[PDB]
């Protein structure tokens, strides 16, 4: 169908808070193979972030029930099977996003800002796979997340200002990856504190962009105080 109709459907899906529809429209925009403008890339990401986010959050509630039900075997089985159905959707969605990234988005990216945004995405989606990873894949998945992040982060440090939201958002997520997935609060703190100081030191920016950057810096500070007890 027509790219621009698909994009309009994505925006209507978004106003309706129907993120699965929204993702399906943006996915098929992507699959026509032309590079996405910013707006479109934002719609794609917003859609899939909500789709995967509803499942991660459901996965958490149910995993946690499954843990509390050891070892009432029949109840635990109910929770575990439901957990697996959720995980089944979570993996399919991560796989889809990761395949889009590899076939279309990262290949087509013609500016640094896009490259970084998409490699950050790749880190994020491998990270969501890691959150629920079966012991025998976990290692490969975690390596895939950390390399995508690390690659995004190197490009952003050479190509974008320390106060750019994309680069800060990436420092936030990469540092959460180190805490939550790699269990290195050290690494996580030094990453976050580093990005936060670099942005302060630059700090110039306008009144709106000044907010976005501040909001993300607030998240970095918040995690920092948290993680240092």
């Amino acid at each position: 169908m027509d790219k621009n109709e698909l994009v309009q459907k994505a925006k209507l899906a978004e106003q309706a808070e129907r993120y699965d529809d929204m993702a399906a429209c943006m996915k098929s925009v992507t699959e026509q193979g032309a590079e996405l403008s910013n707006e479109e890339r934002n719609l794609l990401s917003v859609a899939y972030k909500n789709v995967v986010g509803a499942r991660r959050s459901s996965w958490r509630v149910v995993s946690s029930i499954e843990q509390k039900t050891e070892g009432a075997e029949k109840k635990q089985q109910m929770a575990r099977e439901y957990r697996e159905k959720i995980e089944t959707e979570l993996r399919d969605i991560c796989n889809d996003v990761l395949s889009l990234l590899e076939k279309f988005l990262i290949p087509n990216a013609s500016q640094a800002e896009s490259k970084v945004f998409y490699l950050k995405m790749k880190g994020d989606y491998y990270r969501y796979l890691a959150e629920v990873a079966a012991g025998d894949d976990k290692k490969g998945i975690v390596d895939q997340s950390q390399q995508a992040y690390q690659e995004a982060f190197e490009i952003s440090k050479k190509e974008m200002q320390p106060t750019h939201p994309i680069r800060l958002g990436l420092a936030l997520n990469f540092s959460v990856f180190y805490y939550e997935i790699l269990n290195s609060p050290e690494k996580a703190c030094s990453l976050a504190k580093t990005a936060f100081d670099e942005a302060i030191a630059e700090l110039t920016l306008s009144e709106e962009s000044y907010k976005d950057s501040t909001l993300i810096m607030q998240l970095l500070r918040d995690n920092l105080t948290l993680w240092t007890s």
Partner: peptide, 11 residues
């Protein structure tokens, strides 16, 4: 804004 939301920020 659109961009903040699109960045899928961790907590």
């Amino acid at each position: 804004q659109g961009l903040l939301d699109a960045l899928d920020l961790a907590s």
